[PDB]
Amino acid sequence: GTRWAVLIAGSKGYANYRHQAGVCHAYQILKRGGLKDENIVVFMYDDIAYNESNPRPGVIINSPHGSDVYAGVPKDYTGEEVNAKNFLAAILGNKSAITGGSGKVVDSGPNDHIFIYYTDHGAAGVIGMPSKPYLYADELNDALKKKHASGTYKSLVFYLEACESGSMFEGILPEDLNIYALTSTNTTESSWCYYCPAQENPPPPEYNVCLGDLFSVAWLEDSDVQNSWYETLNQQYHHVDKRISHASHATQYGNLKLGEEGLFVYMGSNPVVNQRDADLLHLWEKFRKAPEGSARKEEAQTQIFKAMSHRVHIDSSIKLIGKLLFGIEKCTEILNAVRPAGQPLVDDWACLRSLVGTFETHCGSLSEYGMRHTRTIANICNAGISEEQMAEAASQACAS
Amino acid sequence: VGTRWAVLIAGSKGYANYRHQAGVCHAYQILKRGGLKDENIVVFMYDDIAYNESNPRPGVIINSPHGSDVYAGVPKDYTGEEVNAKNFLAAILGNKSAITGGSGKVVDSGPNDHIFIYYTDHGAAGVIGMPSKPYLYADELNDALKKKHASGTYKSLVFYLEACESGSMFEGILPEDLNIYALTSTNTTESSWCYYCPAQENPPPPEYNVCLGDLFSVAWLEDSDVQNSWYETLNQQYHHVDKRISHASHATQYGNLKLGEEGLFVYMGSIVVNQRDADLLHLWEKFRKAPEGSARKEEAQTQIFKAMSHRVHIDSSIKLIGKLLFGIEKCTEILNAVRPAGQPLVDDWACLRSLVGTFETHCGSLSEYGMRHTRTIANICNAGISEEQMAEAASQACAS
């Protein structure tokens, strides 16, 4: 049939350069592979190529000596059109549910193949969007269940780059939907950046940012060289696992039988720094390179201070709510609860959402950094704490 | 030699205006083939065509019957309401601080650089449309080109303008000493014509109920597709389009005509329908093709009725204000005033704007259709009528 692709960078801001660089790079692979622009839905906040901080205006590179990946890339949903509702509607092929953008959706048939590539921030049971609302594991897996129920694809391959990305499918994604998922990490690990100033192969001196993410750069570089007929999904999985092992465990979910299929089926044929710290890396690089006594050094220093102030505040505030809700003693610091292997993060997702909501309305936003604490709040949710109980505990811990 | 830059802008929205965006995508394919880099080509297009509910070929835009797709690969710098006068003038001037939304790409050119500007849409005497108001008047535009010249950020500039009465945008305004060469689709007073229309010589495929091109646009675009850029000069291209379009309108040259001797490679690398009636042709085509007793035929019929009602209303209302303001005698109803050759449309442009403003706030909208009557209001402006006098006359004529 037809090979379709959905490519989505779930973040914004110059520091998140890598996520959009990865989406432009995935597009160049598919275009080279023979996929038509009408079948490739691109979601990218379009704020990198002409960012005030980009040293090469109009260009986006994914490796240090890499060529431009920005030119020729389709823009279906940019800016605030990059959102959960539009992402789920593009997957489902439902144009009536789209708001803004080109209106391109995955209006596929039963002989069609779908390749979904998502790159950004994530935490336990959640993946980011450039602005809230975020996309939780239940919300996403319900959209994939509805897609399967409509019989509008043969098989679907889902590659997800985010921290704790495993938590998006573990104990949720069934092996009977003809969906194969590949996450950058397992349920609890963090993903790492690659092509970073303070790292192995560094970007040109002009760059203060990571050009790639390790898992993304692994499969993208693997797809650039190794032949699509020559290679299977299982082979690619093993090539990325080999390159990424020290940092994370790329994990396979769903129908692993699909791993035996070739990459050409979905992609056509051609012929270290922690992701959660990468924002600070950038401010430190900005600071370090800046001349002494300059406004740029004074600005960078104050940015580091502001970022540190928010990180310290959020961490101390969650740490409080947990002691304030149960006690400090024996068997009372279950915020470090480890969910057993193969179980979903939470049972009542609507409750996890309400508990994250009450924290935010009392203690401040979990809007990028805070996202890391989604597991702590899930353990609070699983402990049986209600929205009433949570808001009460939060109210005291964030008393000004 | 320096860098070759381009600005491509479709000044309209709506499926009926298919042709303006088709022309912009076609101009981009010419420049890409010619060797121009995406980072030097600033594209303004509404982007409501490729996935319009009415487009019979979703994801494709064609600029001629039997023509291939011209939409894939096209950059999208400013789409939707980012397609506006302020952003268009800011992209020309290379001033990113004055841009609102979009990629942020501007013409940040140097003194050895060449600029090619192509605008296609609706126009009237001294005005060119934007997908929504405010419209761009001849003084506003020529002031932006004067400021661009004053900054010494180009060697020479070519401006191709497709709109009705397009010559009125430069006549008596565009100086011959700015190193600017302009080519308009028509005279100061003529109308431009569509081409590749359902009711015409070479018709679009039966699925299309809209004009695929504009005579002037299709002329120079098709001329640029075949004839070699080193082989051809601006004067030669002008003569090729004049030969092809003569019966419809007079392509007119403005500014420094000495630049006509330069080759196209310098800037670009190496029985008919009236534009003012094209909207109606579409409604009539929709109606004619629709099966009898169907909701589509009932809908198309009511659309024709609504459009006719507004046209009749606006024409009768301006016709009134003119008689109401001076009288019916042959010396008094002189709003058929012919501006002497080489003189600007008006002297007080701020007054022309205020007079168009007062008409609109008392009678209907002077948008796509109403735009026609700008010359009538300019003649009223030139006659010495004030905003007080205009609003008074308008107030009585639209009591009906």
PDB file of N, CA and C in Angstrom, chain B residues 289-334:
ATOM      1  N   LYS B 289     -22.315  21.672 -12.244  1.00  0.00           N
ATOM      2  CA  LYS B 289     -21.885  20.275 -12.077  1.00  0.00           C
ATOM      3  C   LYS B 289     -22.709  19.489 -11.042  1.00  0.00           C
ATOM      4  N   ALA B 290     -23.217  20.171 -10.006  1.00  0.00           N
ATOM      5  CA  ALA B 290     -24.014  19.581  -8.931  1.00  0.00           C
ATOM      6  C   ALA B 290     -25.276  18.865  -9.407  1.00  0.00           C
ATOM      7  N   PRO B 291     -25.581  17.636  -8.897  1.00  0.00           N
ATOM      8  CA  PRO B 291     -26.810  16.940  -9.345  1.00  0.00           C
ATOM      9  C   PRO B 291     -28.063  17.669  -8.877  1.00  0.00           C
ATOM     10  N   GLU B 292     -29.127  17.656  -9.688  1.00  0.00           N
ATOM     11  CA  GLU B 292     -30.381  18.319  -9.356  1.00  0.00           C
ATOM     12  C   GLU B 292     -31.036  17.736  -8.111  1.00  0.00           C
ATOM     13  N   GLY B 293     -31.653  18.602  -7.307  1.00  0.00           N
ATOM     14  CA  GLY B 293     -32.310  18.223  -6.059  1.00  0.00           C
ATOM     15  C   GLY B 293     -31.364  17.857  -4.924  1.00  0.00           C
ATOM     16  N   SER B 294     -30.049  18.062  -5.120  1.00  0.00           N
ATOM     17  CA  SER B 294     -29.040  17.764  -4.107  1.00  0.00           C
ATOM     18  C   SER B 294     -28.783  18.981  -3.220  1.00  0.00           C
ATOM     19  N   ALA B 295     -28.255  18.727  -2.018  1.00  0.00           N
ATOM     20  CA  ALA B 295     -27.928  19.756  -1.042  1.00  0.00           C
ATOM     21  C   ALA B 295     -26.820  20.635  -1.586  1.00  0.00           C
ATOM     22  N   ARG B 296     -25.846  20.045  -2.335  1.00  0.00           N
ATOM     23  CA  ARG B 296     -24.765  20.806  -2.963  1.00  0.00           C
ATOM     24  C   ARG B 296     -25.329  21.852  -3.951  1.00  0.00           C
ATOM     25  N   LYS B 297     -26.254  21.452  -4.870  1.00  0.00           N
ATOM     26  CA  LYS B 297     -26.881  22.396  -5.809  1.00  0.00           C
ATOM     27  C   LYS B 297     -27.648  23.496  -5.074  1.00  0.00           C
ATOM     28  N   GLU B 298     -28.446  23.115  -4.043  1.00  0.00           N
ATOM     29  CA  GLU B 298     -29.181  24.035  -3.164  1.00  0.00           C
ATOM     30  C   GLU B 298     -28.199  25.017  -2.475  1.00  0.00           C
ATOM     31  N   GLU B 299     -27.011  24.518  -2.044  1.00  0.00           N
ATOM     32  CA  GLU B 299     -25.976  25.307  -1.380  1.00  0.00           C
ATOM     33  C   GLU B 299     -25.323  26.273  -2.344  1.00  0.00           C
ATOM     34  N   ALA B 300     -24.918  25.771  -3.519  1.00  0.00           N
ATOM     35  CA  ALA B 300     -24.253  26.562  -4.556  1.00  0.00           C
ATOM     36  C   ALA B 300     -25.160  27.680  -5.049  1.00  0.00           C
ATOM     37  N   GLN B 301     -26.461  27.377  -5.266  1.00  0.00           N
ATOM     38  CA  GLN B 301     -27.471  28.349  -5.706  1.00  0.00           C
ATOM     39  C   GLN B 301     -27.581  29.496  -4.689  1.00  0.00           C
ATOM     40  N   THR B 302     -27.666  29.162  -3.392  1.00  0.00           N
ATOM     41  CA  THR B 302     -27.783  30.149  -2.319  1.00  0.00           C
ATOM     42  C   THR B 302     -26.495  30.976  -2.182  1.00  0.00           C
ATOM     43  N   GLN B 303     -25.321  30.385  -2.464  1.00  0.00           N
ATOM     44  CA  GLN B 303     -24.037  31.098  -2.452  1.00  0.00           C
ATOM     45  C   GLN B 303     -23.997  32.147  -3.568  1.00  0.00           C
ATOM     46  N   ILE B 304     -24.444  31.775  -4.793  1.00  0.00           N
ATOM     47  CA  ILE B 304     -24.500  32.669  -5.951  1.00  0.00           C
ATOM     48  C   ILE B 304     -25.393  33.837  -5.574  1.00  0.00           C
ATOM     49  N   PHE B 305     -26.596  33.527  -5.028  1.00  0.00           N
ATOM     50  CA  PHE B 305     -27.568  34.522  -4.581  1.00  0.00           C
ATOM     51  C   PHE B 305     -26.985  35.505  -3.567  1.00  0.00           C
ATOM     52  N   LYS B 306     -26.242  34.981  -2.568  1.00  0.00           N
ATOM     53  CA  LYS B 306     -25.618  35.793  -1.535  1.00  0.00           C
ATOM     54  C   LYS B 306     -24.552  36.701  -2.133  1.00  0.00           C
ATOM     55  N   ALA B 307     -23.672  36.137  -2.983  1.00  0.00           N
ATOM     56  CA  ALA B 307     -22.595  36.880  -3.640  1.00  0.00           C
ATOM     57  C   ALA B 307     -23.148  37.987  -4.534  1.00  0.00           C
ATOM     58  N   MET B 308     -24.218  37.679  -5.328  1.00  0.00           N
ATOM     59  CA  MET B 308     -24.876  38.632  -6.230  1.00  0.00           C
ATOM     60  C   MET B 308     -25.507  39.762  -5.445  1.00  0.00           C
ATOM     61  N   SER B 309     -26.112  39.425  -4.289  1.00  0.00           N
ATOM     62  CA  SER B 309     -26.751  40.380  -3.397  1.00  0.00           C
ATOM     63  C   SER B 309     -25.757  41.395  -2.854  1.00  0.00           C
ATOM     64  N   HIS B 310     -24.547  40.938  -2.512  1.00  0.00           N
ATOM     65  CA  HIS B 310     -23.514  41.818  -1.980  1.00  0.00           C
ATOM     66  C   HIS B 310     -22.898  42.681  -3.070  1.00  0.00           C
ATOM     67  N   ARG B 311     -22.657  42.090  -4.253  1.00  0.00           N
ATOM     68  CA  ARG B 311     -22.098  42.810  -5.390  1.00  0.00           C
ATOM     69  C   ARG B 311     -23.021  43.943  -5.772  1.00  0.00           C
ATOM     70  N   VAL B 312     -24.317  43.630  -6.030  1.00  0.00           N
ATOM     71  CA  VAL B 312     -25.383  44.594  -6.374  1.00  0.00           C
ATOM     72  C   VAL B 312     -25.462  45.731  -5.337  1.00  0.00           C
ATOM     73  N   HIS B 313     -25.509  45.365  -4.044  1.00  0.00           N
ATOM     74  CA  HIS B 313     -25.561  46.304  -2.935  1.00  0.00           C
ATOM     75  C   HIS B 313     -24.405  47.302  -2.933  1.00  0.00           C
ATOM     76  N   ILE B 314     -23.141  46.806  -2.985  1.00  0.00           N
ATOM     77  CA  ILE B 314     -21.910  47.610  -2.948  1.00  0.00           C
ATOM     78  C   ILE B 314     -21.822  48.574  -4.140  1.00  0.00           C
ATOM     79  N   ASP B 315     -22.046  48.064  -5.369  1.00  0.00           N
ATOM     80  CA  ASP B 315     -22.017  48.846  -6.613  1.00  0.00           C
ATOM     81  C   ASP B 315     -23.051  49.955  -6.598  1.00  0.00           C
ATOM     82  N   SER B 316     -24.295  49.629  -6.185  1.00  0.00           N
ATOM     83  CA  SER B 316     -25.374  50.621  -6.134  1.00  0.00           C
ATOM     84  C   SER B 316     -25.099  51.657  -5.054  1.00  0.00           C
ATOM     85  N   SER B 317     -24.526  51.224  -3.936  1.00  0.00           N
ATOM     86  CA  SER B 317     -24.193  52.103  -2.834  1.00  0.00           C
ATOM     87  C   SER B 317     -23.063  53.090  -3.177  1.00  0.00           C
ATOM     88  N   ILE B 318     -21.984  52.647  -3.891  1.00  0.00           N
ATOM     89  CA  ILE B 318     -20.924  53.593  -4.279  1.00  0.00           C
ATOM     90  C   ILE B 318     -21.512  54.572  -5.311  1.00  0.00           C
ATOM     91  N   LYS B 319     -22.234  54.017  -6.326  1.00  0.00           N
ATOM     92  CA  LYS B 319     -22.884  54.750  -7.417  1.00  0.00           C
ATOM     93  C   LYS B 319     -23.719  55.911  -6.857  1.00  0.00           C
ATOM     94  N   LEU B 320     -24.430  55.653  -5.739  1.00  0.00           N
ATOM     95  CA  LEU B 320     -25.242  56.603  -4.997  1.00  0.00           C
ATOM     96  C   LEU B 320     -24.390  57.727  -4.421  1.00  0.00           C
ATOM     97  N   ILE B 321     -23.461  57.407  -3.490  1.00  0.00           N
ATOM     98  CA  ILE B 321     -22.549  58.353  -2.815  1.00  0.00           C
ATOM     99  C   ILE B 321     -21.955  59.403  -3.789  1.00  0.00           C
ATOM    100  N   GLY B 322     -21.632  58.963  -5.006  1.00  0.00           N
ATOM    101  CA  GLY B 322     -21.074  59.795  -6.064  1.00  0.00           C
ATOM    102  C   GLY B 322     -22.038  60.807  -6.637  1.00  0.00           C
ATOM    103  N   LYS B 323     -23.317  60.408  -6.783  1.00  0.00           N
ATOM    104  CA  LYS B 323     -24.380  61.288  -7.277  1.00  0.00           C
ATOM    105  C   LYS B 323     -24.794  62.208  -6.114  1.00  0.00           C
ATOM    106  N   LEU B 324     -24.958  61.628  -4.913  1.00  0.00           N
ATOM    107  CA  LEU B 324     -25.331  62.274  -3.651  1.00  0.00           C
ATOM    108  C   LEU B 324     -24.337  63.348  -3.212  1.00  0.00           C
ATOM    109  N   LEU B 325     -23.064  63.204  -3.601  1.00  0.00           N
ATOM    110  CA  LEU B 325     -21.989  64.118  -3.224  1.00  0.00           C
ATOM    111  C   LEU B 325     -21.799  65.296  -4.195  1.00  0.00           C
ATOM    112  N   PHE B 326     -22.085  65.106  -5.505  1.00  0.00           N
ATOM    113  CA  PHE B 326     -21.874  66.169  -6.494  1.00  0.00           C
ATOM    114  C   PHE B 326     -23.099  66.568  -7.334  1.00  0.00           C
ATOM    115  N   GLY B 327     -23.906  65.588  -7.729  1.00  0.00           N
ATOM    116  CA  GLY B 327     -25.067  65.753  -8.597  1.00  0.00           C
ATOM    117  C   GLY B 327     -25.017  64.748  -9.734  1.00  0.00           C
ATOM    118  N   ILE B 328     -26.001  64.794 -10.652  1.00  0.00           N
ATOM    119  CA  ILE B 328     -26.072  63.854 -11.784  1.00  0.00           C
ATOM    120  C   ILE B 328     -25.527  64.470 -13.100  1.00  0.00           C
ATOM    121  N   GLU B 329     -25.451  65.832 -13.207  1.00  0.00           N
ATOM    122  CA  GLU B 329     -24.931  66.558 -14.385  1.00  0.00           C
ATOM    123  C   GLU B 329     -23.537  66.044 -14.808  1.00  0.00           C
ATOM    124  N   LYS B 330     -23.259  66.019 -16.139  1.00  0.00           N
ATOM    125  CA  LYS B 330     -22.019  65.495 -16.753  1.00  0.00           C
ATOM    126  C   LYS B 330     -20.699  66.072 -16.192  1.00  0.00           C
ATOM    127  N   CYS B 331     -20.725  67.287 -15.608  1.00  0.00           N
ATOM    128  CA  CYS B 331     -19.548  67.919 -15.009  1.00  0.00           C
ATOM    129  C   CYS B 331     -19.404  67.527 -13.520  1.00  0.00           C
ATOM    130  N   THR B 332     -20.546  67.216 -12.836  1.00  0.00           N
ATOM    131  CA  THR B 332     -20.634  66.870 -11.404  1.00  0.00           C
ATOM    132  C   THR B 332     -20.409  65.375 -11.082  1.00  0.00           C
ATOM    133  N   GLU B 333     -20.935  64.433 -11.891  1.00  0.00           N
ATOM    134  CA  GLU B 333     -20.734  62.992 -11.637  1.00  0.00           C
ATOM    135  C   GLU B 333     -19.342  62.472 -12.092  1.00  0.00           C
ATOM    136  N   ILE B 334     -18.329  63.374 -12.200  1.00  0.00           N
ATOM    137  CA  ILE B 334     -16.958  63.058 -12.629  1.00  0.00           C
ATOM    138  C   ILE B 334     -16.163  62.385 -11.502  1.00  0.00           C
TER     139      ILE B 334
END
